[PDB]
Amino acid sequence: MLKKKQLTVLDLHPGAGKTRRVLPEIVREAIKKRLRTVILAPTRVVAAEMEEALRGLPVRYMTTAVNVTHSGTEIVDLMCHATFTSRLLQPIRVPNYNLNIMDEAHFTDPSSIAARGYISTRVEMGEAAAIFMTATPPGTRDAFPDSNSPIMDTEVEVPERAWSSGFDWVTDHSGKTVWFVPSVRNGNEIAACLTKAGKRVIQLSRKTFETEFQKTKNQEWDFVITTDISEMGANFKADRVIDSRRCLKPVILDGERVILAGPMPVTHASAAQRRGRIGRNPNKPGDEYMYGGGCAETDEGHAHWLEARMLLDNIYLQDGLIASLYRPEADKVAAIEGEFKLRTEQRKTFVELMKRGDLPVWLAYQVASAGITYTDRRWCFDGTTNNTIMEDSVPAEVWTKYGEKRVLKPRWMDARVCSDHAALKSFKEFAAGKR
Numbered sequence: 001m002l003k004k005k006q007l008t009v010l011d012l013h014p015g016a017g018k019t020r021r022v023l024p025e026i027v028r029e030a031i032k033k034r035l036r037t038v039i040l041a042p043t044r045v046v047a048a049e050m051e052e053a054l055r056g057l058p059v060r061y062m063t064t065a066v067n068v069t070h071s072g073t074e075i076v077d078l079m080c081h082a083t084f085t086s087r088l089l090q091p092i093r094v095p096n097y098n099l100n101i102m103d104e105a106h107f108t109d110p111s112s113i114a115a116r117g118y119i120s121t122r123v124e125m126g127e128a129a130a131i132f133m134t135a136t137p138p139g140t141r142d143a144f145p146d147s148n149s150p151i152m153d154t155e156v157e158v159p160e161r162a163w164s165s166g167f168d169w170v171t172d173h174s175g176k177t178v179w180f181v182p183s184v185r186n187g188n189e190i191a192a193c194l195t196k197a198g199k200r201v202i203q204l205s206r207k208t209f210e211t212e213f214q215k216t217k218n219q220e221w222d223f224v225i226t227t228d229i230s231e232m233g234a235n236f237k238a239d240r241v242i243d244s245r246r247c248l249k250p251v252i253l254d255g256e257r258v259i260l261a262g263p264m265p266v267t268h269a270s271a272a273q274r275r276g277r278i279g280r281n282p283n284k285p286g287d288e289y290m291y292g293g294g295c296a297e298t299d300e301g302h303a304h305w306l307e308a309r310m311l312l313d314n315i316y317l318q319d320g321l322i323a324s325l326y327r328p329e330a331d332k333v334a335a336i337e338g339e340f341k342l343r344t345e346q347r348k349t350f351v352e353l354m355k356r357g358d359l360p361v362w363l364a365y366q367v368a369s370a371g372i373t374y375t376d377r378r379w380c381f382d383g384t385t386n387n388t389i390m391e392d393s394v395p396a397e398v399w400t401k402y403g404e405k406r407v408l409k410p411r412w413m414d415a416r417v418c419s420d421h422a423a424l425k426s427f428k429e430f431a432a433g434k435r
């Protein structure tokens with residue numbers, strides 16, 4: 001599978017040994033054939049587990065999640081999906097890798113979709129080989145794939161708020177449970193309910209993942225309350241998954257604003273990945289998967305695919321050519337290649353608003369395309385009254401870089417900048433000119 005012009009999907013079931021067994025064999029063969037190779041990990045947590053599976057082998061780890069002394073003799077680089085896309089966007093030269101390996105290639109974050117688009121286009125061009133490793137490739141319709149040991153699948157009503165009665169099965173469990181919730185705010189409510197009932201709960205989300213995941217190995221716990229981030233290779237020593245089967249969906253309305261629609265059903269790929277956290281030990285059959293809804297193709301019209309197109313339009317490929325999205329996921333957005341291509345100075349602003357401003361791709365694009373410079377924050381306060389960001393049922397206020405107290409009222413409203421307390425605190429720091 002290492003020959004040029006070939007894109008291979010390694011779709012072995014969850015827990016089949018794609019990372020610990022297959023990946024080191026591919027790396028040895030790539031080193032033997034002198035292929036300049038890139039290994040892409042979804043998160044810093046997967047990069048650390050990859051270093052254990054590849055230990056000894058000459059790999060250059062382009063992440064601070066691993067503390068290794070690189071000899072300078074490595075032809076295999078390892079980095080996160082977001083780092084690969086970020087380096088493509090930045091002026092820095094990225095080697096034209098002969099072999100491109102993506103682990104957890106089902107990741108739907110905009111930078112992962114862009115990385116898939118770029119790589120598959122290089123393969124279509126006949127310039128590279130690629131391997132996409134995932135049990136759930138784009139287009140999967142099977143929510144119940146094979147596992148290392150039989151799983152008990154039970155369709156049941158799953159609580160999405162605190163409860164006083166009616167769900168005895170949840171707390172009448174003596175093992176360890178991983179519970180997938182549609183949002184951080186929904187997880188806070190359930191974790192509070194479980195804590196009041198005497199349970200030890202750990203909460204996981206995109207912004208707290210590396211730090212809080214370590215607690216699942218360093219201490220005893222009864223529940224792990226997590227968003228969809230734990231569908232990306234996160235592994236637990238648990239015997240039950242409780243799955244609300246719901247997620248939030250970012251949606252662009254009238255090309256003017258972004259709302260977080262839902263909670264709505266997850267895709268079959270997400271349901272299979274959430275279920276896949278258990279049934280992994282062949283010596284422990286009978287792990288349970290309790291699910292509270294059906295699946296649907298909620299990736300169609302989801303803002304991440306439009307955001308991936310804004311990223312690929314601003315990545316150099318060859319002269320005026322622009323990378324297409326990976327074919328099985330290209331119909332998820334109505335977008336023409338090149339429509340988001342920015343001129344030099346606006347593109348640099350777009351990259352900085354994402355890299356340093358920490359803004360969502362769509363919002364970074366609106367600011368940069370309007371000809372606004374990175375440090376100009378007047379747009380955070382000159383929007384209509386209905387764009388007022390609310391905190392504790394009262395309009396959010398910040399002190400501007402001028403020393404003036406003003407109501408946070410962005411010219412373009414993206415619900416992701418205030419989806420939880422941590423997001424709004426970061427957006428207030430941005431509006432104030434603190435980064």
Ligand SMILES: NS(=O)(=O)c1ccccc1OC(F)F
Nearest residue numbers: 031032034058073074075076
């Ligand atoms: N992939 S690797 O680092 O083992 C390698 C590949 C081709 C030549 C030399 C070499 O290593 C040596 F420099 F130590």
